[PDB]
Design a protein around this ligand. Sequence first.
Ligand SMILES: [C]C(=O)[N][C]1[C](O[C][C][C][N-]=[N+]=[N-])O[C]([C][O])[C]([O])[C]1O[C]1O[C]([C][O])[C]([O])[C](O[C@@]2(C([O])=O)[C][C]([O])[C]([N]C(=O)[C][O])[C]([C]([O])[C]([O])[C][O])O2)[C]1[O]
Ligand SMILES: [C]C(=O)[N][C]1[C](O[C][C][C][N-]=[N+]=[N-])O[C]([C][O])[C]([O])[C]1O[C]1O[C]([C][O])[C]([O])[C](O[C@]2(C([O])=O)[C][C]([O])[C]([N]C(=O)[C][O])[C]([C]([O])[C]([O])[C][O])O2)[C]1[O]
Ligand SMILES: [C]C(=O)[N][C]1[C](O[C][C][C][N-]=[N+]=[N-])O[C]([C][O])[C]([O])[C]1O[C]1O[C]([C][O])[C]([O])[C](O[C@]2(C([O])=O)[C][C]([O])[C]([N]C(=O)[C][O])[C]([C]([O])[C]([O])[C][O])O2)[C]1[O]
Ligand SMILES: [C]C(=O)[N][C]1[C](O[C][C][C][N-]=[N+]=[N-])O[C]([C][O])[C]([O])[C]1O[C]1O[C]([C][O])[C]([O])[C](O[C@]2(C([O])=O)[C][C]([O])[C]([N]C(=O)[C][O])[C]([C]([O])[C]([O])[C][O])O2)[C]1[O]
Lengths: 116, 116, 117, 120, 117
Amino acid sequence: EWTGDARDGMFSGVVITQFHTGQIDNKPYFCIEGKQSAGSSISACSMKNSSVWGASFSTLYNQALYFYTTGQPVRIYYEPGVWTYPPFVKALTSNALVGLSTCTTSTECFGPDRKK
Amino acid sequence: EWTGDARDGMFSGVVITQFHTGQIDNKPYFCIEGKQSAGSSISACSMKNSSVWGASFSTLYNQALYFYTTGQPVRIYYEPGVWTYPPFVKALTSNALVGLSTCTTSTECFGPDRKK
Amino acid sequence: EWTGDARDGMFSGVVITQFHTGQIDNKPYFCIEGKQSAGSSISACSMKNSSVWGASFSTLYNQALYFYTTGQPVRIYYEPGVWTYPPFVKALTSNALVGLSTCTTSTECFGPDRKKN
Amino acid sequence: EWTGDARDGMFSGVVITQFHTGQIDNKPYFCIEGKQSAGSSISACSMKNSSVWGASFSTLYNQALYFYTTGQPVRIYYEPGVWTYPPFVKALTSNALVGLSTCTTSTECFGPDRKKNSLE
Amino acid sequence: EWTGDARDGMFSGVVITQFHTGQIDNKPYFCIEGKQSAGSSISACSMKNSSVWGASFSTLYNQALYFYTTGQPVRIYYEPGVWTYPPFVKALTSNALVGLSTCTTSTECFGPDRKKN
Ligand SMILES: [C]C(=O)[N][C]1[C](O[C][C][C][N-]=[N+]=[N-])O[C]([C][O])[C]([O])[C]1O[C]1O[C]([C][O])[C]([O])[C](O[C@@]2(C([O])=O)[C][C]([O])[C]([N]C(=O)[C][O])[C]([C]([O])[C]([O])[C][O])O2)[C]1[O]
Ligand SMILES: [C]C(=O)[N][C]1[C](O[C][C][C][N-]=[N+]=[N-])O[C]([C][O])[C]([O])[C]1O[C]1O[C]([C][O])[C]([O])[C](O[C@]2(C([O])=O)[C][C]([O])[C]([N]C(=O)[C][O])[C]([C]([O])[C]([O])[C][O])O2)[C]1[O]
Ligand SMILES: [C]C(=O)[N][C]1[C](O[C][C][C][N-]=[N+]=[N-])O[C]([C][O])[C]([O])[C]1O[C]1O[C]([C][O])[C]([O])[C](O[C@]2(C([O])=O)[C][C]([O])[C]([N]C(=O)[C][O])[C]([C]([O])[C]([O])[C][O])O2)[C]1[O]
Ligand SMILES: [C]C(=O)[N][C]1[C](O[C][C][C][N-]=[N+]=[N-])O[C]([C][O])[C]([O])[C]1O[C]1O[C]([C][O])[C]([O])[C](O[C@]2(C([O])=O)[C][C]([O])[C]([N]C(=O)[C][O])[C]([C]([O])[C]([O])[C][O])O2)[C]1[O]
């Protein structure tokens, strides 16, 4: 697997506006929410020692909280359909957070594309 | 188990006003106290390596200290009756700290409801 | 053992003014000095992987450096006679740092008391 | 191996301007981009438990994010040809980040040179 | 072994002005450079998992970067002759960083002396 795999998906020029941390199945997790200037919203969660993307938890939490603090427009890389516990998906999202990037414009950000 | 389980409980729109850290039974712990603008108060502790909520100790420590620093209104997810050692409950609380969220309003905060 | 055991002791409303880190017997340690006002000094050190209170080293380091930075009056929970290497005690203290609390006044602080009955 | 080995290479007086984090093959990684005074770019990636430079991931991540925050002109030490997965190299770089230093000038920086020797 | 051992040595009232991090022999390390009021210079490196002082790497990195950020005058505790790889020593120093202290004056700092007899 790779953050820059030709898959869904990414949202660019996102300001991280909301932050939530919790626990499920003996694993700490965090979720972020971001809004583009056009009003489009994206939610993505990361879990410690989880499925495929668990190894990134520590780095993503640090980066996400950093980006929440500065308020800078960033790129959210996500993989849909990862989290499957229905009440979790309902209240939050099925999206796993798979990467983060700084942006130069609302569409142009550092690093790989993640798109079909 | 999950932060968003249909149980007690959560306080929304809380400013974290007090912070305590210590050790019991070879386990580090921290407790927070927070006030809602109505002056209503909530206490919760997180303890490393404890039974159910111990896994999220360091994540919650980092996040609670972050929120204490910013002074922003947040949501405290707790579970009552977790700590049972009487002098500990008397001095602090039985409530385990179970999650944290940023809030858009005094009652509306990011993530799941923890509601019985 | 517990931070809030009815034992010696605690110093409430302390501004942490001094900070030191070193190593002894393959173990990193930090130590703090602060004044009440009042005016009296308290010193306490925490040591990684130390016998009784080693579990709290990482948390207390983080919290102590935070409180040193803000300058806010805080409570120092300590256990006397923990550190025993005589030059260490002479230059620093025998006091182990066993907990920290935020304070509302110079004596009223969040969390348990640590005092003898 | 050593950061100060007589090899390619180093860029001095670099301001870290871009930051990216991700995962590949079950390993977290971060990448940085920086600009020198004239606008010339250098990219370098650090990857946890990777090749020979994997041990430095945590320190480099902390230090690079620190310098990104301050906007200090810094020395980027790098080793080309380390990352070999083609889409990764194409999107980012083959350069591994192998060191960081503060700088007193745009060209004078603390610590060793990472430089090929010249021929007499 | 201890930071406050009667050995070489210490520089008091230094401002940490330069910071370097890298890797040698699969070990992450960092080095600092500090200047005293008079202009006198001191360099010291801390290396993860290396020699007797390796256990302090994380604490010392955290504390040195903190002190570099504040720019406050501090005490560098060091041990000369620890690093032996000639190109490393030439480009940086043989001195291992063994401890750090806040200072009240240019000579008076918190904690032990590290002085020869
Ligand atoms: C510029 C750019 O950006 N590009 C493009 C263009 O091209 C041109 C050429 C030049 N180049 N330079 N660089 O074109 C245009 C038309 O006019 C367009 O197409 C563009 O693109 C863009 O767009 C935008 C708006 O529409 C958007 O879409 C973008 O994308 C994204 C981002 O943001 O980035 C991508 C993707 O991934 C996403 N997602 C999906 O698809 C699913 O997941 C999208 C969306 O959806 C989101 O964001 C929400 O809104 O988008 C682009 O880039
Ligand atoms: C969120 C909100 O706002 N909700 C509600 C409403 O609904 C609407 C819908 C939603 N969505 N939107 N979009 O409605 C209204 C009228 O009807 C109201 O009711 C609201 O509610 C509220 O209220 C209040 C009072 O009355 C309160 O309750 C709140 O919250 C809480 C918080 O804080 O969060 C919830 C609960 O959970 C809690 N807790 C408990 O129960 C314990 O465990 C509460 C209280 O009690 C506390 O806080 C104390 O103070 O609250 C709500 O929400
Ligand atoms: C010192 C100096 O500066 N060096 C040199 C000189 O020398 C002088 C004498 C000795 N003594 N003192 N100390 O010389 C000159 C002529 O003759 C020259 O060569 C110099 O060099 C320089 O140059 C420049 C040009 O622009 C540059 O190159 C510099 O730097 C660098 C940095 O940045 O650091 C170095 C190197 O390493 C690099 N890299 C490479 O090569 C590969 O990697 C370079 C470049 O390329 C970059 O940066 C881009 O821009 O550069 C030098 O130093
Ligand atoms: C207190 C003090 O400071 N000391 C002294 C004095 O006092 C005496 C009395 C008793 N004590 N009190 N308690 O006196 C004076 C006049 O005589 C003097 O001597 C002093 O001393 C000082 O001096 C200075 C100049 O010379 C210096 O030396 C100082 O310090 C040091 C530091 O910095 O810390 C010390 C030592 O350790 C060092 N090092 C060595 O030796 C080797 O490592 C020194 C030097 O060398 C350096 O720094 C260079 O710069 O110094 C003293 O303290």
